[PDB]
């Protein structure tokens, strides 16, 4: 039973991802997050034993093998009108959107560390056959003591494929111009676009584009002092033509990405 295994705490948030409560696993006081998703809102479904579960459960299981920069699904339950997902909860934690709001534009050394860990997390998803489709600062949690970033909210994701995607329910201001223009995109190159938006967000303090005309226009104005190397990487990730964007390997080999801090160094220098 779900009610006897977990002590439920305050609501942490609610939105397109459902309703998420703080919780504690009774058997060992492990901090958890308890996420409720209404069945009537689940668009894409999957099978595990063939049990019909939300695709989000399928994707979380595929990536929750071992230790990584992805939120770990510990358990899940079916209720009459909803599914309940138990996720491991870092503590203390702050999501990257609130972090950037409070700190402003991030020093490039800190943006490099954060961006590197997000790249490693997204590579892990893709290695496991999972496309997140909603990479953004709001969907990244910072473990403030360990200096580790965790990707959350796979509810807009999909199985990774090499053919074209023609559906999308992620965040429009992180979506690529080929989606805006043609309602078509491929998984990896669209992911790289959202990563370019995320990196601009980190080093400038907010995302570059709010409107469709800006997304498709292909001009990146820098509102903060940003190094030439970082600017080049951002503009490369935000190439209008998807085939002009870097691979994950080219991103991580980029000159701006070298000499990344370890997670614990990042915490000690920037977070503690």
């Amino acid at each position: 039973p779900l009610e006897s295994q977990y002590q439920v705490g305050p609501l942490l948030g609610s939105g397109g991802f459902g309703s998420v409560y703080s919780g504690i696993r009774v058997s060992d006081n492990l901090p958890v997050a308890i996420k409720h998703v209404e069945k009537d809102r689940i668009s894409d479904w999957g099978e595990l034993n063939g049990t019909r579960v939300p695709m989000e459960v399928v994707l979380l299981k595929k990536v929750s093998s071992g230790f990584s920069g992805v939120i770990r699904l510990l358990d899940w339950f079916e209720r009459p009108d909803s599914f309940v997902l138990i996720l491991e909860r870092p503590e203390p934690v702050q999501d990257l959107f609130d972090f950037i709001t409070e700190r402003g534009a991030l020093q490039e050394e800190l943006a490099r560390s954060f961006f590197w860990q997000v790249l490693e997390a997204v590579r892990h998803c893709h290695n496991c056959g999972v496309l997140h489709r909603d990479i953004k600062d709001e969907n990244i949690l910072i473990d403030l003591n360990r200096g580790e970033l965790k990707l959350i909210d796979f509810g807009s994701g999909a199985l990774l494929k090499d053919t074209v995607y023609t559906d999308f329910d992620g965040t429009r201001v992180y979506s690529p111009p080929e989606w805006i223009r043609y309602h078509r995109y491929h998984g990896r190159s669209a992911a790289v676009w959202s990563l370019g938006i995320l990196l601009y967000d980190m080093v400038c303090g907010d995302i570059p584009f709010e409107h469709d005309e800006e997304i498709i226009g292909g001009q990146v104005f820098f509102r903060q002092r940003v190094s030439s190397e970082c600017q080049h990487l951002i503009r490369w990730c935000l190439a209008l033509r998807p085939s002009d964007r870097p691979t994950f390997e080219e991103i991580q080999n980029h000159p701006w990405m070298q000499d990344v801090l370890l997670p614990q160094e990042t915490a000690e220098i920037h977070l503690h």
Partner: peptide, 9 residues
């Protein structure tokens, strides 16, 4: 300049 969250799903 107004920074805001953006919905998804």
């Amino acid at each position: 300049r107004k920074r805001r969250r953006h919905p998804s799903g």
